Amino acid sequence: MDKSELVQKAKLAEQAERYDDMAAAMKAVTEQGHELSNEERNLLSVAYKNVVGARRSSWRVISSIEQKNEKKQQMGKEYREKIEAELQDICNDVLELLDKYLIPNATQPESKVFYLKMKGDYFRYLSEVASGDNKQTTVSNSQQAYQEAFEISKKEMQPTHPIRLGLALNFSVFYYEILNSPEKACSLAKTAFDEAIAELDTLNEESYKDSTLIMQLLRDNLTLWTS
Amino acid sequence: MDKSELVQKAKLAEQAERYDDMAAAMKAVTEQGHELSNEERNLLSVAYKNVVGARRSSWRVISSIEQKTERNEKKQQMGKEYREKIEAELQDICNDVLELLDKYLIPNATQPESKVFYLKMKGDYFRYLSEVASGDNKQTTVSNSQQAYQEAFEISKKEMQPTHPIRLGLALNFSVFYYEILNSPEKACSLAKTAFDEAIAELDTLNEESYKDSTLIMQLLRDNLTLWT
Amino acid sequence: RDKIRLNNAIWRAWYIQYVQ
Amino acid sequence: RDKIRLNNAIWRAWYIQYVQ
């Protein structure tokens, strides 16, 4: 009843581009305790990626402006720190959702890699704006969530599984952008790409379009990071 | 805080596309009682047009979903409830603007550009209310819009040349008011045509600081005209 | 500038749709 | 689909330019 209503509201909110509404509705579905279906899991992920993404995008614009007038620079810091506070509230809600509901209520290996990769993602977004001891904490938790998700995927999923591929794509981005290590980044990405291509027979009718798309994104990232 | 600080915050908000912050900074500047400069007035206007505009588009999407719900299930009721949520947000935003206009902006200036600017602004936001209002509230919103547009229309003909961008932009929006709100296409096309033809007959009055704007609004007046025929 | 005309044209067009 | 590839390229590009 309320779940089906909330999912419809989330669908209407996404159409109306009101992604804060969409995240709120999908948050309520998650807090009802049940394991999210594949449609619900996608709705929640799309909602919060739009919600956190708006603040990441705003933060980046202000950051470039800051770097490019004593009182103006002082003001740029305050508006950026306002956005950073918003960023942390969004990530902490999502990471709470993961640690109380999504991850523990995750039963099959595929969902566990999905939600652990999510935890690494949102800890990574914190690391983009974090500082000091908080940054070292977020970086460690992000890297650890990615690594644990990575080990499960190597043991339970084919190299062409879109969740395994998208996990490798983001883990490589974590090495490039959060740590200052372009070589691991390029190293992880190529390996991931090469294993998927080495196993092109594993592509399945349900996601070959998604598998190939992420394979192409790994390649695009590799070109950008070497050209 | 201080006015000079708030305008910088408003400028940063616009760059970050955080227009809700941008209207907030400009609403606070307006509430300080002093007359807004042209840049401040533009900063306030762009902010609220983005803020009210976001809900107008969302309202338009949900309304379109409603009129395409053949599957007449619970989705229709949910769409109604969600549309009414957006409509409530829309009404609060317009009411914030109309309060600002009627408590500060319209009284704070006696020159005809500020008077036409802020009266046209009042017509716009009463127009946005009428797009979703119904019953006894809409007849209040509509004629209130027409009255603000009408007064701005009279002042503009008496103090501005037909190529003035504010005067042209008022004719553009007043013509839209006849088409979309008053369901009167003949006047919308007529009002837009006379405003364009008056500006064209008076092209020598173009100014070095506004010819790009004057001609842009002239082109939009034409675009609305052809689209409507 | 040519975008501004596109935004207005697409915005003005939706009303014809919903009114028909 | 080419949208996602273009979106990804622009998001990844900001960091390379921001730190250089």
Ligand SMILES: Nc1ncnc2c1ncn2[C@@H]1O[C@H](COP(=O)(O)O)[C@@H](O)[C@H]1O
């Ligand atoms: N302001 C925004 N609004 C909506 N989506 C965004 C925004 N900024 C970024 N995104 C999306 O978020 C993704 C970022 O993921 P990642 O590469 O893990 O940072 C991008 O590929 C964009 O599609």
Ligand SMILES: Nc1ncnc2c1ncn2[C@@H]1O[C@H](COP(=O)(O)O)[C@@H](O)[C@H]1O
């Ligand atoms: N969501 C939005 N964000 C920014 N501007 C918008 C939005 N929706 C509509 N507009 C603009 O608002 C104007 C419509 O107002 P009007 O022409 O007075 O009906 C056009 O210039 C649109 O481009």
